[PDB]
Amino acid sequence: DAMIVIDGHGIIQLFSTAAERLFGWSELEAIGQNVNILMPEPDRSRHDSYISAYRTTSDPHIIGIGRIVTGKRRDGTTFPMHLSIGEMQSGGEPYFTGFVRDLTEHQQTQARLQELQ
Amino acid sequence: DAMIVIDGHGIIQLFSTAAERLFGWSELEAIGQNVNILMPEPDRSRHDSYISAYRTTSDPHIIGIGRIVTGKRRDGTTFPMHLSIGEMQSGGEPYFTGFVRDLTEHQQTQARLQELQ
Amino acid sequence: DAMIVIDGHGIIQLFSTAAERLFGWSELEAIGQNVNILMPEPDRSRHDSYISAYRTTSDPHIIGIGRIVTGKRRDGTTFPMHLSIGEMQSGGEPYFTGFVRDLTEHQQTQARLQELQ
Amino acid sequence: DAMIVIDGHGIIQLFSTAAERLFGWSELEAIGQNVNILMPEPDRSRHDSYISAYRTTSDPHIIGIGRIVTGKRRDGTTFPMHLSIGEMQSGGEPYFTGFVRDLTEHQQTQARLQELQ
Amino acid sequence: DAMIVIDGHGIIQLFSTAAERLFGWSELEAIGQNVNILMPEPDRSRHDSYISAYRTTSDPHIIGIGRIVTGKRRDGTTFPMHLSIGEMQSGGEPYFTGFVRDLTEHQQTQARLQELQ
Amino acid sequence: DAMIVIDGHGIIQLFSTAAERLFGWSELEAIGQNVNILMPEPDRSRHDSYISAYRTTSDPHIIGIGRIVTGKRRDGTTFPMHLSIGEMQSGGEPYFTGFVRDLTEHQQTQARLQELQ
Numbered sequence: 001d002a003m004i005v006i007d008g009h010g011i012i013q014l015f016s017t018a019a020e021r022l023f024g025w026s027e028l029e030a031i032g033q034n035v036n037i038l039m040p041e042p043d044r045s046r047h048d049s050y051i052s053a054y055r056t057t058s059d060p061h062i063i064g065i066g067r068i069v070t071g072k073r074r075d076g077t078t079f080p081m082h083l084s085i086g087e088m089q090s091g092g093e094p095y096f097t098g099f100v101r102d103l104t105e106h107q108q109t110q111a112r113l114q115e116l117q
Numbered sequence: 118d119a120m121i122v123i124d125g126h127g128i129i130q131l132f133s134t135a136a137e138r139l140f141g142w143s144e145l146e147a148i149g150q151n152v153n154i155l156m157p158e159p160d161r162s163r164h165d166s167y168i169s170a171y172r173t174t175s176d177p178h179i180i181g182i183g184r185i186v187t188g189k190r191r192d193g194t195t196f197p198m199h200l201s202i203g204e205m206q207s208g209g210e211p212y213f214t215g216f217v218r219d220l221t222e223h224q225q226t227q228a229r230l231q232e233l234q
Numbered sequence: 235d236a237m238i239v240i241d242g243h244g245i246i247q248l249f250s251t252a253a254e255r256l257f258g259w260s261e262l263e264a265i266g267q268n269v270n271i272l273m274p275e276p277d278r279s280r281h282d283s284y285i286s287a288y289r290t291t292s293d294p295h296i297i298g299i300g301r302i303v304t305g306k307r308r309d310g311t312t313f314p315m316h317l318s319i320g321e322m323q324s325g326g327e328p329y330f331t332g333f334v335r336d337l338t339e340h341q342q343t344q345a346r347l348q349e350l351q
Numbered sequence: 352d353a354m355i356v357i358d359g360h361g362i363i364q365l366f367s368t369a370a371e372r373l374f375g376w377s378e379l380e381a382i383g384q385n386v387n388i389l390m391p392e393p394d395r396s397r398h399d400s401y402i403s404a405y406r407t408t409s410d411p412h413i414i415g416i417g418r419i420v421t422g423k424r425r426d427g428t429t430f431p432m433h434l435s436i437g438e439m440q441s442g443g444e445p446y447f448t449g450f451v452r453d454l455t456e457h458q459q460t461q462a463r464l465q466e467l468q
Numbered sequence: 469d470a471m472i473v474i475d476g477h478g479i480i481q482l483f484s485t486a487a488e489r490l491f492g493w494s495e496l497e498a499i500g501q502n503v504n505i506l507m508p509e510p511d512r513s514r515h516d517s518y519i520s521a522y523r524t525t526s527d528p529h530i531i532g533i534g535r536i537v538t539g540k541r542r543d544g545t546t547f548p549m550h551l552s553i554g555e556m557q558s559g560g561e562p563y564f565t566g567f568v569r570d571l572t573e574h575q576q577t578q579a580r581l582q583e584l585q
Numbered sequence: 586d587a588m589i590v591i592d593g594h595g596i597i598q599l600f601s602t603a604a605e606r607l608f609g610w611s612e613l614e615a616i617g618q619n620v621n622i623l624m625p626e627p628d629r630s631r632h633d634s635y636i637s638a639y640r641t642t643s644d645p646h647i648i649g650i651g652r653i654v655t656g657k658r659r660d661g662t663t664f665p666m667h668l669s670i671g672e673m674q675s676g677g678e679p680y681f682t683g684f685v686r687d688l689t690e691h692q693q694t695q696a697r698l699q700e701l702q
């Protein structure tokens with residue numbers, strides 16, 4: 001699956017090839033942008049508050065738990081995806097790694113089985 | 118899973134043992150019959166048009182894509198199944214191979230999990 | 235997954251560690267109790283009749299078939315689980331083995347994919 | 352896979368259907384016999400010492416670890432199998448559960464791949 | 469995996485796309501050729517005798533059993549593969565279906581793990 | 586599995602929790618060290634030449650191919666592992682991501698099956 005690394009403020013630092021395939025942004029396009037560009041509203045506007053809340057409280061909601069969420073492609077289409085977040089440290093500052101698993105195929109098979117009785 | 122081979126007009130040429138188990142027709146019973154006997158209406162009556170449309174346009178809908186569809190047993194019961202279609206040539210004429218995966222178990226587990234809250 | 239063994243009257247004889255983790259009862263707590271404590275009503279009150287009906291008729295409903303059912307934890311929360319039942323004999327009397335697979339994760343992933351369009 | 356339950360002295364108390372298929376002994380034949388009948392020498396003669404050593408020291412070698420060992424069928428043929436052992440208590444005495452996974456297929460595929468260059 | 473269909477004399481009748489990828493022969497190249505071109509000697513020269521022996525005796529060695537064998541590519545390189553054979557009838561004559569699973573990756577991983585201690 | 590990120594000179598920039606578990610080095614201990622500390626000789630001394638050779642030639646040996654290699658823990662024990670390498674760019678410089686899959690379990694099961702006939 002796809003891999004993204006962000007700094008303590010949600011800025012994309014590293015964007016894997018698979019992330020380019022999934023989200024539609026090239027590495028140069030994605031790096032330097034806030035990770036919130038990869039999700040729809042309301043999560044998009046709230047994303048910084050999610051990171052800030054974790055830095056303040058150290059209380060995890062997805063970190064070490066995982067969660068299926070809605071992601072957004074550059075073309076504006078949305079998709080279901082599983083998200084796991086790793087916490088790292090480099091040069092005195094926090095960095096977060098995001099592993100993204102596209103569940104579009106799963107969602108469609110399930111809806112199709114439901115739709116066929 | 119089950120395997121069927123048809124000629125360019127939808128006539129069953131080869132019918133595997135697993136196809137006999139799934140559809141309820143023996144090989145001798147199935148061979149020489151149109152593949153449309155394995156599906157309910159409206160697909161059943163439209164099936165020849167689907168094959169003819171592909172021979173004319175060469176524009177695929179399931180070939181090289183795959184699709185979950187409703188199949189029909191000889192006893193008249195229907196079931197969800199995944200279908201993949203391979204295109205072959207033998208003695209100057211087109212033949213199509215169909216690989217069928219019975220998704221009855223999957224559909225029932227899913228409906229049951231949904232029904233139990 | 236979890237394993238439980240009961241006598242011909244539904245009394246728990248053996249309760250695996252994994253069963254302790256899933257149901258919330260320790261082995262000493264569970265042993266000597268009727269297996270009906272592991273399920274909600276109406277199955278709970280009917281459970282003895284299910285065992286008695288099998289001893290009389292020898293007609294199986296889950297034995298050698300399997301079934302997804304709702305189980306109940308000691309804290310009173312319910313969960314979906316797959317149940318397989320094995321039939322054994324020891325010292326002239328019937329014993330039944332129950333293999334339990336927790337499908338909570340499966341049910342939640344499915345509901346979540348459905349809820350996200 | 353196969354399931355066996357023994358008392359604190361290695362006597363078979365319960366023998367699943369799958370264990371009957373794998374080992375070649377029927378449930379009535381197996382129950383009341385020492386579990387050592389299911390393995391070749393030298394493990395066979397040493398088996399009681401393995402159980403006794405655990406009761407004395409409480410130091411596990413397979414319990415909670417697992418191990419691939421050589422098992423023996425009634426017809427005298429041997430096979431590789433994975434063994435996991437669960438420890439239980441019933442009516443003041445220890446009982447042990449053995450889950451057996453036949454690895455014959457695995458061993459043969461591996462030897463065959465090795466033998467074909 | 470790859471699929472091939474032969475007549476009662478070992479002549480290739482149908483050759484799937486995946487078979488073209490695995491063996492190196494195109495469908496037109498393969499059709500009309502004996503299936504023995506897909507294996508090295510000594511199996512190659514003996515192959516007709518294997519089919520003839522089955523037609524005479526009806527005693528199976530791979531049919532309904534399966535077997536890992538050495539296959540051969542057009543470029544002359546050999547590889548390990550699993551073979552399953554289905555028996556069919558069409559227009560009064562026997563046809564055989566061969567499902568081929570390339571085990572090159574498996575063999576190499578295994579040899580590599582062995583070579584690294 | 587484990588994840589490591591290095592700069593264009595083999596210096597560890599990010600070291601995941603799973604990498605800490607596998608290699609035995611904490612993140613602070615690993616960061617700033619050359620990736621060659623994670624492998625035995627001769628690869629260890631040659632590692633810089635492997636990276637330099639890729640920067641010069643752009644000719645891949647593991648990048649986009651994968652390879653099972655011998656890794657080394659801090660305690661000095663070695664293990665078989667599968668390695669996949671991703672190539673990234675950040676702030677005008679190349680970075681490489683390494684995904685490490687511990688194959689110790691696989692190697693031991695295989696050796697054990699071989700050793701038991």
Ligand code: HEM
Nearest residue numbers: 004006038039043050051054060061062063069096097098
């Ligand atoms: C692309 C789609 C994504 C969506 C829709 C999403 C959404 C969310 C949500 C709902 C939360 C928790 C808020 C709460 O429940 O109170 C969260 C937290 C967080 N996310 Fe994202 N996220 C996405 C991607 C990412 C990625 C790729 C990373 C890392 C590279 C990341 C880093 C974080 C961090 C560091 C937190 C705070 C820690 C925590 O609450 O566990 N997110 N996000």
Ligand code: HEM
Nearest residue numbers: 121123155156160167168171177178179180186213214215
């Ligand atoms: C048994 C249940 C089946 C059902 C319900 C079914 C239904 C369909 C549908 C919906 C289409 C596409 C029409 C469209 O979207 O415009 C199609 C096309 C086609 N099917 Fe079937 N099919 C079945 C089995 C098979 C089998 C077993 C074969 C081959 C042996 C086969 C051969 C073809 C061919 C050659 C086409 C045209 C190519 C294409 O559109 O990709 N079908 N079928």
Ligand code: HEM
Nearest residue numbers: 238240272273277284285288294295296297303330331332
């Ligand atoms: C914990 C949740 C469980 C639930 C909700 C449950 C429910 C049921 C149901 C619905 C039936 C069949 C009644 C019918 O369809 O007519 C049944 C039968 C039976 N159950 Fe349970 N069961 C549970 C656990 C167990 C366990 C762990 C065992 C064995 C240790 C067990 C032993 C049996 C036996 C012996 C029968 C009769 C045989 C048969 O009908 O196949 N049950 N149960």
Ligand code: HEM
Nearest residue numbers: 355357389390394401402405411412413414420447448449
């Ligand atoms: C059938 C083939 C079997 C073989 C070859 C085998 C062999 C062994 C070996 C090698 C040990 C450890 C001795 C040591 O390393 O010091 C052991 C221990 C033990 N085994 Fe077996 N065993 C078999 C089946 C079983 C089964 C089915 C059970 C339970 C039903 C069982 C119960 C135990 C117990 C309770 C111990 C002592 C606890 C421990 O050392 O972890 N064994 N066995």
Ligand code: HEM
Nearest residue numbers: 472474506507511518519522528529530531537564565566
């Ligand atoms: C390409 C590599 C292949 C090799 C090395 C191979 C080798 C063999 C061997 C060793 C036997 C059994 C002889 C014996 O043990 O006495 C056999 C039998 C047979 N094979 Fe092949 N085979 C290959 C492919 C195929 C394919 C693709 C088909 C069908 C399309 C096929 C059809 C048959 C038939 C019909 C028999 C006789 C039935 C039986 O003995 O079970 N073979 N082959």
Ligand code: HEM
Nearest residue numbers: 589591623624628635636639645646647648654681682683
């Ligand atoms: C820890 C055990 C490792 C071993 C034994 C190892 C060994 C090797 C070997 C044998 C080569 C290719 C030399 C050749 O065949 O000519 C290579 C190349 C390379 N490795 Fe490592 N490696 C390890 C870990 C890593 C990690 C974790 C990374 C990245 C974070 C990495 C980055 C690279 C790069 C960038 C190349 C050059 C590109 C290429 O040849 O494809 N290595 N390594």
